[PDB]
Amino acid sequence: NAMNFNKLKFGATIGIIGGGQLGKMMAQSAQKMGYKVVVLDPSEDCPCRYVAHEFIQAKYDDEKALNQLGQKCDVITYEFENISAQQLKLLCEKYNIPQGYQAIQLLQDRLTEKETLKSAGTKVVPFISVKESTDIDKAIETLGYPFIVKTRFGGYDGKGQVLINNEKDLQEGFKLIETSECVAEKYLNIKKEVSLTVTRGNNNQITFFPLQENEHRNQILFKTIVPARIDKTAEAKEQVNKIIQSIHFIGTFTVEFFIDSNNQLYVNEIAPRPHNSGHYSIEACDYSQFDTHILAVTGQSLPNSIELLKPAVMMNLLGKDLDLLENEFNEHPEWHLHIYGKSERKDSRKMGHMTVLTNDVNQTEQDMYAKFE
Amino acid sequence: FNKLKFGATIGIIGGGQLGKMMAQSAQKMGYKVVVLDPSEDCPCRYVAHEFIQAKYDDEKALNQLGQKCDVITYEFENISAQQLKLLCEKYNIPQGYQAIQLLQDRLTEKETLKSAGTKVVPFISVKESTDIDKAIETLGYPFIVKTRFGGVLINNEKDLQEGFKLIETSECVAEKYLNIKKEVSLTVTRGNNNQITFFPLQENEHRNQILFKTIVPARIDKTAEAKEQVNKIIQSIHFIGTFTVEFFIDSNNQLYVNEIAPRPHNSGHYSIEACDYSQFDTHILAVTGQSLPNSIELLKPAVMMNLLGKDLDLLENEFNEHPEWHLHIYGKSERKDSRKMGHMTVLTNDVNQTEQDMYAKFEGSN
C-alpha cells in the first residue's frame, strides 16, 4: 500500500469498475476535470454507459475484461464492493490502483468488518458469528433479546437481515442461516443515525465532509439532513482516525454510525466508496464527494476543508417515489432532481434523488414528510 | 409548448464546451442527449447518448437530429437564420430563429435595439464611400467601423484611408468609440409562461478581445439598470433558455447594451460552483418546459479565469497543488495559444485579494 503514488494530469484515463449511478457521478466529475473514462459493467443499460469514453460490458469476475480495463487506463477505481478481493489483488499488482485490495477484502464480509473495527479499538456493537444452527444458542446467551441476524456476504439496503425480538422469531432466523453464513449483533435502541464521508489522498492527505444525519425507511436510506442536528463530528473523527490505522483508504469512503437512546456512538459499517448519504454535497458544498474522489485517486492535492455553502435535505427516489411524485417534478425546481436513467423501474430500486437546499432544515424536513406520505 | 419529462431526448447543435456542459446537466437530470458537430474530437462527444458527425449546414443530418429528438437547442451561433427558421417550423426548437437572425447583422441588431428603447451606442450605417463623412459629423472622433455581416478603429485623419478601404466592397456599421470604465454581463433564463430568472451581475475583463476574468458580484452597482434593459430587449426578441446580455459602462458611468448571446455564455460558467443553479441547469429546465427557480442565489463570491492554450503552457504543472482552483478542462486534443481549453473558478470571500493573486499568477502568459 503506497503512501505516495502517481500524480495524473488531465488527459489521463480513469477506469471504473461498476456503472451504477455512483460510477456515473464519478465519471461526470472526471470528464468535467478533463480525464477520460472507461467503465466496466455487465449491463448494457448501466447509467454510466454514456458518460464514458469507452464501455466494456463484462462481469465483475471476468479476468480478461478486467485486464483489458487495466490496459486502457492510467488509474483504476471501483464503484461498488462487488469484485472479488482475489481478482483485485492480481490487478493492483499489475496496474495502478492506489485504493489497493485490503479495503475491499475486509469490508466485503460483515464478520471481517466487525472484527477489524473492534481490533482498531473503535466502539462496535457487540457481535458474534453464526454459520450453524447451534451458534444461535450462543447468540441468545451472549447478546440477549433483542438482537439481529445479518448475512455476511450479500446484503445491501436492509436485505438479508432478520430481527429477533422474542423466541417466536428464531424460526425466521434459522431459515436465513440454513442458506448463508451470518453474523448476530445487539439490536440497539437508536435515536439518530449519522455518517461521515471522508477522502484520503496522496502523502497522507485527508478531508472530511460535514456530518450528515440519516433516516432510513424499510432499512433503505430515505432522508439525509446536513448539518446533522446532533453534535458528534469530533467523536466521529476520532473513530475514523482509529479505522485508518488498520485499513488503507484512498479516495472517498464513508463510515456509518449509530447513536444510542443514551447518546452513545457506535461504528456500524464502512463503505469504501462514495455513499448514498453524500449525494447532497453536489449542490450544498464547494466540493462534492465525487470531485474529491477523482482528485484523490489521480493523486492531486485535496482541499484541507469542505464548506457547507447551504444546509440541505436530500431524499432518495425509489421507483415507488417516482410513481407518487413524478408529475409534480416540473413545478419544483428547488428539488434539484437527479434521475439516474435506469430503464427498469421497480418499487424499491433507487432511481434518482433530490436535494433541497434550505435555510430552515426543520421546516423542509416537515415539508418532505408530508410529500412522501 | 412541449413540457418534457425525464427520459426524453435533447438534441444539441454544436459539440464544443458549451454543448458539453449542457449535456452534463441534461444527463444528470435524466434526459438523453444527441449532439451534432463536424469534429469527431468535439468535447461533447462522450457525454451524449448519440453523436451525429456533420456540418451545421448539412440539412439531412439536421433532419436526422430532429427525428431523433424531443427538443433541439443550439450551443452557439453555428447555423444560418433561414435554415434554422425551417428547422423551428418542422421540429421543437424553443430558442427559435428570431434572435439568431437579428444578430447576424449588426445594423438590424442596432436598429431593433434602438426601436426597443434600450441604450445603444450611437451609430450610423456606412454603406457608401461618402457616408464616412456623415459619420464624422454625427459620431466624431473617435468612432469605429464594423462589417455589417459575418463576424477597425478610426482615431483621426490617418486611419481614414484604412477605413475607406473596408467600405470599398463590404457594407459597414459605424459607432462611437467609448472610453470604457467597466464591462458587465447579465445572464438570464427565460422559460414557459413568461418566467424570467436573473443570475448575479457579472464583471468581465477582456484581453486581446478574449474573455480573461469574470468577477461576481460585479464591483459596480448596475443590476437594476441592467435588468431594465433586459426587460426591454425581451419585448422585442424571443428567448427561451439562458442568454446573456453584455454591457459597457463608460467613464461617466453611462450603461450601454453591447451585444446579446442567445445561449449560455462564457461569463456565466462560474455559476456551476458559486450559485445554487448553473446557467446550464436552468437552460435545460427552460428548454424542456419545466418551471424555473424565482431567483438565483450567489452562495459564495467567485473569480473565474479562462484557460487558453498559453495559460495551460504556463500553469498546468501547478494544477495538482490547487484544488481551490476548481479546474474544468474541456478535453480538446489540439492545444493552441489563444484557443479556450478550460476555465477555473475560484470561490473566495475576498474577491479583491483573489483578483491580485490571479493577475500575479497569469502574468507570465501576457
Ligand SMILES: Nc1ncnc2c1ncn2[C@@H]1O[C@H](COP(=O)(O)OP(=O)(O)O)[C@@H](O)[C@H]1O
Ligand atoms: N444493531 C442494530 N440496532 C438497531 N438498528 C439497526 C441495527 N443494525 C441495523 N439497524 C437498522 O438497519 C439499517 C440497515 O442496517 P445495515 O447493517 O447498514 O444494512 P445495510 O448494509 O443493508 O444497509 C440501519 O441503518 C439501522 O437503522
Ligand SMILES: Nc1ncnc2c1ncn2[C@@H]1O[C@H](COP(=O)(O)OP(=O)(O)O)[C@@H](O)[C@H]1O
Ligand atoms: N464603443 C466602443 N468603445 C470601446 N470599445 C468598443 C466599442 N464598441 C466595441 N468595442 C470593442 O469590441 C469588443 C466587443 O465585441 P466582441 O469582443 O466581439 O464581443 P464580446 O463582448 O463577447 O467580446 C470589445 O472588446 C471592445 O474592445
Ligand SMILES: [Mg+2]
Ligand atoms: Mg447501511
Ligand SMILES: [Mg+2]
Ligand atoms: Mg467586449
